[PDB]
Enzyme design. Structure first.
Site, PDB file in Angstrom:
ATOM      1  N   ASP A  82       0.847  -1.181   0.000  1.00  0.00           N
ATOM      2  CA  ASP A  82       0.000   0.000   0.000  1.00  0.00           C
ATOM      3  C   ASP A  82       0.885   1.234   0.000  1.00  0.00           C
ATOM      4  OD1 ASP A  82      -2.197   1.591   0.041  1.00  0.00           O
ATOM      5  OD2 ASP A  82      -2.366   1.686   2.215  1.00  0.00           O
ATOM      6  N   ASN A 109       1.356   6.544   4.080  1.00  0.00           N
ATOM      7  CA  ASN A 109       2.081   5.542   4.842  1.00  0.00           C
ATOM      8  C   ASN A 109       3.605   5.762   4.809  1.00  0.00           C
ATOM      9  OD1 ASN A 109      -0.373   4.138   5.445  1.00  0.00           O
ATOM     10  ND2 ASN A 109      -0.260   3.022   3.502  1.00  0.00           N
ATOM     11  N   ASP A 128       1.512   1.097   8.113  1.00  0.00           N
ATOM     12  CA  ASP A 128       0.473   0.385   7.407  1.00  0.00           C
ATOM     13  C   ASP A 128       0.989  -0.797   6.606  1.00  0.00           C
ATOM     14  OD1 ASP A 128      -2.086  -0.226   6.841  1.00  0.00           O
ATOM     15  OD2 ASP A 128      -2.500   1.490   5.630  1.00  0.00           O
TER      16      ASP A 128
HETATM   17  N1  LIG Z   1       3.064   4.894  14.157  1.00  0.00           N
HETATM   18  C1  LIG Z   1       2.571   6.007  13.587  1.00  0.00           C
HETATM   19  N2  LIG Z   1       3.270   7.181  13.690  1.00  0.00           N
HETATM   20  C2  LIG Z   1       2.712   8.382  13.235  1.00  0.00           C
HETATM   21  N3  LIG Z   1       1.462   8.415  12.644  1.00  0.00           N
HETATM   22  C3  LIG Z   1       0.743   7.264  12.557  1.00  0.00           C
HETATM   23  C4  LIG Z   1       1.285   6.046  13.024  1.00  0.00           C
HETATM   24  N4  LIG Z   1       0.373   5.074  12.807  1.00  0.00           N
HETATM   25  C5  LIG Z   1      -0.698   5.648  12.187  1.00  0.00           C
HETATM   26  N5  LIG Z   1      -0.496   7.010  12.043  1.00  0.00           N
HETATM   27  C6  LIG Z   1      -1.473   7.998  11.457  1.00  0.00           C
HETATM   28  O1  LIG Z   1      -2.764   7.385  11.267  1.00  0.00           O
HETATM   29  C7  LIG Z   1      -3.063   7.302   9.884  1.00  0.00           C
HETATM   30  C8  LIG Z   1      -3.733   6.021   9.469  1.00  0.00           C
HETATM   31  O2  LIG Z   1      -3.136   4.918  10.105  1.00  0.00           O
HETATM   32  P1  LIG Z   1      -2.808   3.627   9.220  1.00  0.00           P
HETATM   33  O3  LIG Z   1      -1.920   2.697   9.937  1.00  0.00           O
HETATM   34  O4  LIG Z   1      -2.088   4.058   7.935  1.00  0.00           O
HETATM   35  O5  LIG Z   1      -4.269   2.973   9.026  1.00  0.00           O
HETATM   36  P2  LIG Z   1      -4.939   2.423   7.644  1.00  0.00           P
HETATM   37  O6  LIG Z   1      -4.633   0.972   7.465  1.00  0.00           O
HETATM   38  O7  LIG Z   1      -6.451   2.580   7.809  1.00  0.00           O
HETATM   39  O8  LIG Z   1      -4.524   3.298   6.413  1.00  0.00           O
HETATM   40  C9  LIG Z   1      -1.756   7.475   9.149  1.00  0.00           C
HETATM   41  O9  LIG Z   1      -1.927   7.881   7.796  1.00  0.00           O
HETATM   42  C10 LIG Z   1      -1.043   8.424  10.053  1.00  0.00           C
HETATM   43  O10 LIG Z   1      -1.472   9.735   9.806  1.00  0.00           O
HETATM   44 MG   LIG Z   2      -2.135   3.702   5.944  1.00  0.00          MG
HETATM   45 MG   LIG Z   3      -4.585  -0.693   5.974  1.00  0.00          MG
END
Ligand SMILES: Nc1ncnc2c1ncn2[C@@H]1O[C@H](COP(=O)(O)OP(=O)(O)O)[C@@H](O)[C@H]1O
Ligand SMILES: [Mg+2]
Ligand SMILES: [Mg+2]
Lengths: 155, 247
Positions: free
Chosen positions: B173, B178, B191
């Protein structure tokens, strides 16, 4: 990586030889991972006539319906391979099988305008009175085509 | 009375202010936990996602396997509680590209960040990588996510010839939401649930698509491949887009 998965992939990829090898080694003829799609749907999808009869010989269910209600016969009508619809009919394919929009194969052939498949479906007892879910019968898809061909084989 | 978090984890995050992520688009619930001295992130998926590329446990495993290999957040705590999988992790270093860069109106840097990602992935030894992504695993999973419509395009896709695969590490992805950057370099990847062994043209195709709908000019795509030092295989790229376009 089991036999089922390998058989689905060989059927999907149109590799007739690999389909035969896998069947000889014990692969499940009605294997379906993803969407109710069996090897017979896949081989019909590809237009692979010879291998269809090998799978029926291995006891493949000719009326297996996938998760959209599409039977191999629906698929053969969509693809418009006369040879394939004929063989599936020979082997007990349900001419009035309905999908989830309420189409039967006759409905699908009328959409695609495949004419000499509509003849065959009709002789195998394809009830033309058949209405889909939003009402509009195979007649109402002759008019979508503006066809003095399909309508003029419909009394 | 029943919580979706264990009493033990609730204890542990008590002194952080929870701020739900309103951006994100996956089935996962994501909370930023704002603290006095730092921020953590809590990401949670429900039971029906168990065993999929959407299960945070897979994410957790991949985060752990990638340590020392790619810059990723640290795993602080993982649990299962009542069908839910919960991962508490550290905040990624840097700034999420998409925010503070894609609006800096410099489209050559985006392309280069992506080329730099692909390069990084190609250098990772996947001999013992715990997950592998195939057409079959992708389809099965799509089946399950839809356990509770028009088939023509599925069957059109399935009739298409699949290119032989050349397995590398795959993000799955790859996109600026990400990817994190800091003083020029890639500083973080999040992600990671869809990550693992996969055909190299998967991530590259995502990059081509994203360059195409968010920058919109063929010479940028042609620059992308100049940066990579390889020639495009448009058949392979087309294939994986189609795949991902089955909605
Ligand atoms: N470890 C992290 N450090 C900083 N920001 C994070 C982190 N994990 C998630 N985020 C924030 O949360 C958002 C979405 O989380 P994510 O893991 O990408 O979920 P999804 O699978 O729904 O896309 C990210 O785009 C980011 O802005
Ligand atoms: Mg993501
Ligand atoms: Mg996801």
């Amino acid at each position: 990586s089991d036999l089922g998965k390998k058989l689905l992939e060989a059927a999907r990829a149109g590799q007739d030889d690999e389909v035969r090898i896998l069947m000889a080694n014990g692969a499940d003829v009605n294997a379906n991972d993803w969407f109710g799609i069996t090897p017979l749907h896949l081989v019909v999808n590809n237009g692979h006539l010879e291998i269809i009869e090998v799978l029926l010989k291995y006891a493949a269910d000719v009326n297996a319906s996938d998760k959209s209600g599409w039977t191999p016969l629906h698929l053969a009508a969509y693809r418009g391979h006369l040879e394939i619809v004929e063989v599936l009919l020979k082997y007990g394919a349900d001419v009035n099988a309905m999908d989830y929009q309420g189409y039967t194969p006759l409905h699908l052939a009328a959409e695609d305008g495949h004419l000499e498949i509509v003849e065959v479906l009709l002789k195998y007892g394809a009830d033309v009175n058949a209405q889909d879910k939003f009402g509009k019968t195979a007649f109402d898809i002759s008019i979508d085509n503006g066809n003095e061909d399909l309508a003029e084989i419909l009394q | 009375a029943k919580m979706r978090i264990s009493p033990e984890l609730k204890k542990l995050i008590e002194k952080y202010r929870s701020v739900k992520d309103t951006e994100g688009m996956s089935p996962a619930k994501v909370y930023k936990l704002v603290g006095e001295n730092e921020n953590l992130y809590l990401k949670m998926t429900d039971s029906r996602y168990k065993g999929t590329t959407y299960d945070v446990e897979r994410e957790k495993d991949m985060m752990l396997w990638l340590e020392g290999k790619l810059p990723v957040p640290k795993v602080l705590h993982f649990e299962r509680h009542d069908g839910w999988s919960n991962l508490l992790m550290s905040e990624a270093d840097g700034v999420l590209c998409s925010e503070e860069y894609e609006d800096e109106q410099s489209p050559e840097k985006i392309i280069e960040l992506y080329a730099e990602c692909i390069r990084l992935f190609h250098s990772i030894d996947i001999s013992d990588c715990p997950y592998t992504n195939s057409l079959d695993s992708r389809l099965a999973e799509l089946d399950y996510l839809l356990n509770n419509k028009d088939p023509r395009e599925l069957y059109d896709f399935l009739k298409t010839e699949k290119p032989e695969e050349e397995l590398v590490f795959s993000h799955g992805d790859l996109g600026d939401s990400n990817i994190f950057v800091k003083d020029g370099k890639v500083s973080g990847f999040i992600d990671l649930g869809r990550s693992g062994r996969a055909d190299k043209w998967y991530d590259i195709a995502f990059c081509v698509r994203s360059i195409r709908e968010d920058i919109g000019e063929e010479q940028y795509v042609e620059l992308f491949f100049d940066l990579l030092g390889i020639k495009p295989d448009w058949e392979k790229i087309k294939y994986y887009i189609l795949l991902d376009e089955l909605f």
